[PDB]
């Protein structure tokens, strides 16, 4: 028994608790994010476990700051806790240094917070992965992902959850470098609809958000009209 | 702030049919010295609230930072609930009372205006926690010079129009400039209506008759 | 600091640590106590004189205050700690209430201390049972017992430690108003009860006597020998 | 974490503090420490377990420590715990002197150290101190005293006792050779020499494996001395001659 | 409670009794007593009668039996360390 | 936030297993030697780096503590660094309080008391190092050993690490009470040569001395000059 | 439905709710629900399985000991 | 292994249930609530004839209108009784009124289950209290009787029996209890049940009886009244 | 830096057989100026209790908020609304909690008790409270109290029957005493707010006084 | 076997067994339902008594003038959470003089309840709640589970044998938005009845109702006050 605490190494040099935490997020619905010239776009496949939930309930897209988004996958409690921590870090940075927190700095800080929970037996690794997206004229579009192990990397496009491999394969055909957010929204809808498994999942609702020049640097939920257009495009694609 | 360093003069305010209007000169006085002459003493809390200030300017900046952060936090959740002018007034009152009790007061005298749910608001907050709502407000030396004119006009005519309110504020600002040693010609006007919050540029009390 | 739950419930609703503390008490030297009309007597069996030990430094009978003394069976160190706590509390009560402590007050204090230790964190239960004797301000003789679990009762006469059951049966069979008629009768009762348990007899019994106004008196070996001879 | 906790302050099913018992078992492997009480002084004789041609002679003793102007102690068990407890004893004595401006009686000092030991064996989760101490001293209340202490926190006053290797044999021999109330310091030293001779089965005493200390009163002031090689050798010679004369 | 009050009946049938024996009271004196610990009380209560030379048991005999098979031998037992199934 | 329970406990037969294992780790360490001459002390060790890439002078094993005290070790290097830091801090505290260099015996006692804390404290393991302290106070040389258990002994000559029993036998055969510092250096180097398994050079070993002048680690040139014999 | 299409089923037996109250159930345990749905309908002499028979039999296959779970709420 | 705060696979806290099982070793206690008042009875369970029954205090008074009957581990109940008394007197000091029975039971229950092992308090409790308490008193709402267990659940009971003879005493109470009962009838029925369940013959020296009425305050029946009641049995 | 400022105000309370009146002015002042003309000092706590606070306004607001909060906590914990005696005892406890930095507030609690009668409680800034048939506090306490003693208390008068108080007579007395106080005291006389407490409920009345 | 002993040990399948056990603990509680219309939110709960002579345990509790909760699970933890809710609402009113929106309160609950689920020696709050309240955004119903997760539901039931109620609500979910208060309460009572085990019916002694609306502060109906709603089902 070498996998009962995060403070014990396996004889082959692994921290098994972090692997189990990673496996926890792999059992959740996929949530992809794509970076473009204008900005970044986030999509989440929200499974409707029952028809008794209000549309928008259990939202998995958060606004850590007015210029930084957040899409989560895994245990939703830990995701909300880390969203609160990111909000606190951004507010503290603004109060102390007097300007909006750079996305790379926020990602590094939150990752180090996650990493601090992967060293002691008094705490357990976070069971959630998430991606942050921001846009600024000085800094441009950015997209980062943080895993339970605390690894932060910058992505042009990333997926977290059950269908990470399929989403990554479908994203690779998007030549996202020279596209705008308008086309990326439709592409994200199509990708989410492709990766979704109807046999396993009963039904799902598409949640989208973006931050870019079109939004004047503010992270906000996509207007319902654009969501409906993207959904119709996705249905047309699966003919 | 036991010993205030950079201070501001009166802030005026009067509520009309459809909103409120606030005024304040752009001047930071270092004890009988017009040190800084291009500083705004009015802040936009949100789409339905604006806040003037007097007293220490550093305390005003600290309150600006804190209140802005609270507004950002509220806007992040996106739950459809926004701080109302009364909520901001109550929070400011509690903060000032706590600081006074700790004997580390925020040397400021703030005026809060807003227009939410089709109703106007105009409040007062002193460094000691005194807070009240009245149709017209004047802090600092305005309570002696400008307040009488506002009170007379309002007692004559309880409900004012935007043009009348702006004219009244201009006249009161002119009087304060005449009879206040720490006032400055340039000032700002902030109006809140159903269209949001608008802050007017550096207007001047050009109507300065000097018949000796 | 250390915050591990030393005493925890077990299935069938038992505090196994309390049971082990009682077992440890059972392995200590025997003690006896009898409540007389105008005298309270406490006796103790000495495991071995050893012919080299200083009897002054092994006393199992100690005076908490002027009107209260106790004898303990179990672990000596835990006994010493409880004795010091009881003495400081007695002096504090004298300071505050301005009257001498009552036996009930001090025995309740010891019981509460033991309960707190058996329900605290990172703490082992006190492994001692105490017999507390004394005279209240009203002059009524009193006798109390304490157990590691924190329970205290008033007894006419009890015995704790090895041979507790045998001495208890002896006392139950041979306690009567006649036996407590005179102080010498009470002392003889205590000695006879002890002799049912102690083997060598005579030299292995230490007796301490407290009367109404007089302070605690520890019978010298000659007096115990005379009483033992009179018993025969 | 519960898994790695050794649970050093529990009661065994038979009501025994296992850690205390094991600490006592550890003392059995330490050096032999002996103390005899006489009508005109007290003495401590200890086995110098460390014996090598390369060890240098430093300090006034290897196992006999001084605690006050009128107290000394000898330690058997783990040396580091002995050092910690000796420092604590010195601090306690100095605190008592500062508070009352009078030397601490021996019983009070042994009680304080035993309270520390008891605290360690009741709460804290730490291992008990694996050391037993023999105390000797003089006070204005009871005169010369000789005390003993154990890891459990139990102390008793003794006239002659031994702690360490072959303690039972030393106690038996003393029980047969101790004349209570009729022993001078010279007779006590002779008895200690005999006891050390028989208890250390390894060859005979070489005057380098014995550390003898004395506590005596002279001119109103207590004097604590550590016997030199000459006097120890003289005692060995006298004991050998006496044994030869008997046989 | 209803159970161990019935185990006592099924094991105290072919034995001499005072007839008027409060078996329910005996059942409630051994709350977490396994079936075996109840037969040992019955098989031991009559043991206290073979020693006294009597031929008919009594409730006081059973009470001494419970004091020995349930509360006197509880040091070893098996129930406390097995209901956790570990 | 930190285990509050001691990881060293008494085994049924009365031994502290953790301390024994620490002593085993020490025995697995590098050889070290210390000879107390009549006019100083000498400490010697081995520094066979795993390859030529390692910088010989990058890190030192014979590290000074104060102007008249130095120490050497045999065991885990990082533990030795921690102990060196603590010893220096203790020496400076003593100097501030008393305005006099810390005597070698006193520093030994303080360092040992530091070691004992880790064999009783909660959530810690014994230091896997044994120290050899040298100094010159009160016009006489001093040599001490301190083991993981916290016990310290005074030595006229000693050796630790691998093949330390053989080295101690060698010393017992070769030591003389009336030696000088130079002869002591030669004897120490020879003792190291007994169990070295390789060609000894200036960079392969370390030597330190302590005389009336004070403590100082010998330079490679002096070590080479001594190595001529 | 595969293992239940051999004995009897009232038209009003909502399998969807049955499939929801049985979570973390492997396939084999699912069959035991249908099998036990009958043995417990045989106890109360009848010829038709009813929904409360399936639901009541779900507990028997869950294998959870009675614990006087009645001081909650 | 298996710390204090661990949930069993069925969702029942292990320590709470272990404590609940410990209640079954206590002495039987019966409490009947009547429009005229509330009665509390308990068996003293004398071990030896030498022990003085007067020293066994299984019924205690919290205030002039509240009384509590204990069962289980007597030692654990002392802290809860002290907390109840302190809370009652604090309420009187602050609001100049008498705290209701429900409030006292609620406070005591809140005290229960506040046990922990890590990050709880400098001297927090290690295990739950192994006592079931019967609170009885008269308040603005009339006589009330409340039963509290280690789980912290408290329910108003018209007639509740706790302890070893709980099962069977409850059945008898259901048999005899009716809403229009009178205090004398309640006392008689409680005594009959206690006699039936008790191991030794019932007498004045092995039972405690207390009554609380709207007019009178907490009264603990003395020997003479007890003998008068037992005369009819 | 003075942590206190006197804002004036006069409280009154009369207890009757089957009612209770709590009255107050509506002037807020600071030194020689007037802050507002519509700031009553009467606060409703329950359906059968009213509290009047005068002195330093900030402490008045904080104390009223604390009292309302504590009332809600009591309702939740004890499942019943508090009585006037409970409010009085709690207020006495709260005031003494800040003995070394006392609230500059004068409190008069007026309402109905359990029996259905009228009850008026007076308070000092630190917490000393007592039941009284009528009490006046604030700036013009000295002016109002003697008249209430003479008329309501029938004091210093002989050969006069002690007819019980009537609601109409109580209202007339309140209006007359407050008009007289306004005629003389600078800090009062703007407008009068009367809070009648009866079995049916609480009714509010407003009467105009002289703005001078 | 070794991975179900603490809340800080992940299973190789990616599950925290202690949270599952807490969820089971909540499922072991008694039934409860919650609905909402365009203008009202309703909580109907079924109370069960341990014994025939014991009062039925209360389930619906006050939080503020516009928030209520129905508990299902351990009662002490339920009281702790209710006290936290009450304090948060009181602080919001004290600082901002504004009712706390239900969503923010539920977020605070989630933050509070997540902390035990990540630290050694702590346990999840073994209680599930059905929060109902009215804010500026209209009627709201929320569900909280021992795992620090909350769901915004338009209708949901939790507790023992709650699946029947959920099925009924899903079947009749199309008409909750546009029904009068009486019809909504009747729907809730019908779901609760669907939860009952055949040989039993809703009664005034085992049904409690709580209603919050636009012009109706939160109220609790119990005892004879529920007769108007039952008459018609």
Curated annotation (Swiss-Prot), chain D:
Disulfide bonds: none annotated. InterPro entries: Ntn_hydrolases_N, Proteasome_alpha, Proteasome_alpha-type, Proteasome_asu_N, Proteasome_bsu_CS, Proteasome_sua/b. GO terms for biological process: proteasome-mediated ubiquitin-dependent protein catabolic process. One of its GO terms (cellular component) is cytoplasm. It comes from the Eukaryota. It is found in: Cytoplasm; Nucleus. Belongs to the peptidase T1A family. Keywords: Acetylation, Cytoplasm, Host-virus interaction, Nucleus, Phosphoprotein, Proteasome. PROSITE patterns: PROTEASOME_ALPHA_1, PROTEASOME_ALPHA_2. The 26S proteasome consists of a 20S proteasome core and two 19S regulatory subunits. The 20S proteasome core is a barrel-shaped complex made of 28 subunits that are arranged in four stacked rings. The two outer rings are each formed by seven alpha subunits, and the two inner rings are formed by seven beta subunits. The proteolytic activity is exerted by three beta-subunits PSMB5, PSMB6 and PSMB7. The modification Phosphoserine is found at residues 12, 74, 172. This is Proteasome subunit alpha type-4. Induction: Down-regulated by antioxidants BO-653 and probucol. The modification N6-acetyllysine is found at residues 126, 175.
UniProtKB/Swiss-Prot annotation, chain E:
It comes from the Eukaryota. It is found in: Cytoplasm. Transmembrane segments: none annotated. Induction: Expression is not cell cycle-dependent and occurs throughout the cell cycle. Monoubiquitinated by RNF181. The modification N6-acetyllysine is found at residue 75. Belongs to the AAA ATPase family. Component of the 26S proteasome, a multiprotein complex involved in the ATP-dependent degradation of ubiquitinated proteins. This complex plays a key role in the maintenance of protein homeostasis by removing misfolded or damaged proteins, which could impair cellular functions, and by removing proteins whose functions are no longer required. Therefore, the proteasome participates in numerous cellular processes, including cell cycle progression, apoptosis, or DNA damage repair. Component of the 19S proteasome regulatory particle complex. The 26S proteasome consists of a 20S core particle (CP) and two 19S regulatory subunits (RP). The regulatory particle is made of a lid composed of 9 subunits, a base containing 6 ATPases including PSMC2 and few additional components. Interacts with NDC80/HEC; this interaction is detected only during M phase. Interacts and SQSTM1. Interacts with PAAF1. Directly interacts with TRIM5. This is 26S proteasome regulatory subunit 7. It comes from Homo sapiens. The lineage of its organism: Eukaryota, Metazoa, Chordata, Craniata, Vertebrata. The chain holds residues 348 to 433 of 433 of the full protein.
Curated annotation (Swiss-Prot), chain H:
The lineage of its organism: Eukaryota, Metazoa, Chordata, Craniata, Vertebrata. The 26S proteasome consists of a 20S proteasome core and two 19S regulatory subunits. The 20S proteasome core is a barrel-shaped complex made of 28 subunits that are arranged in four stacked rings. The two outer rings are each formed by seven alpha subunits, and the two inner rings are formed by seven beta subunits. The proteolytic activity is exerted by three beta-subunits PSMB5, PSMB6 and PSMB7. PSMA5 interacts directly with the PSMG1-PSMG2 heterodimer which promotes 20S proteasome assembly. It is found in: Cytoplasm; Nucleus. Expressed in fetal brain (at protein level). One of its GO terms (cellular component) is secretory granule lumen. The modification Phosphothreonine is found at residue 47. Induction: Up-regulated in colon cancer cell lines. Up-regulated in fetal Down syndrome (DS) brain (at protein level). May be the target of the transcriptional activator NFE2L2. Component of the 20S core proteasome complex involved in the proteolytic degradation of most intracellular proteins. This complex plays numerous essential roles within the cell by associating with different regulatory particles. Associated with two 19S regulatory particles, forms the 26S proteasome and thus participates in the ATP-dependent degradation of ubiquitinated proteins. It holds the Pfam family Proteasome_A_N. The modification Phosphoserine is found at residues 8, 48, 55. Its main location: cytoplasm. Belongs to the peptidase T1A family.
Swiss-Prot record, chain J:
There is a cross-link at residues 112, 205 (Glycyl lysine isopeptide (Lys-Gly) (interchain with G-Cter in ubiquitin)). Component of the 20S core proteasome complex involved in the proteolytic degradation of most intracellular proteins. This complex plays numerous essential roles within the cell by associating with different regulatory particles. Associated with two 19S regulatory particles, forms the 26S proteasome and thus participates in the ATP-dependent degradation of ubiquitinated proteins. CDD domains: proteasome_alpha_type_1 (cd03749). Induction: Induced in breast cancer tissue (at protein level). Up-regulated in liver tumor tissues. It is found in: Cytoplasm; Nucleus. One of its GO terms (cellular component) is proteasome complex. The 26S proteasome consists of a 20S proteasome core and two 19S regulatory subunits. The 20S proteasome core is a barrel-shaped complex made of 28 subunits that are arranged in four stacked rings. The two outer rings are each formed by seven alpha subunits, and the two inner rings are formed by seven beta subunits. The proteolytic activity is exerted by three beta-subunits PSMB5, PSMB6 and PSMB7. Interacts with NOTCH3. Interacts with ZFAND1. GO terms for biological process: immune system process; negative regulation of inflammatory response to antigenic stimulus; proteasome-mediated ubiquitin-dependent protein catabolic process. This is Proteasome subunit alpha type-1. Glycans are attached at residue 107. It comes from the Eukaryota. Belongs to the peptidase T1A family. SMART domains: Proteasome_A_N. The modification Phosphoserine is found at residues 107, 174.
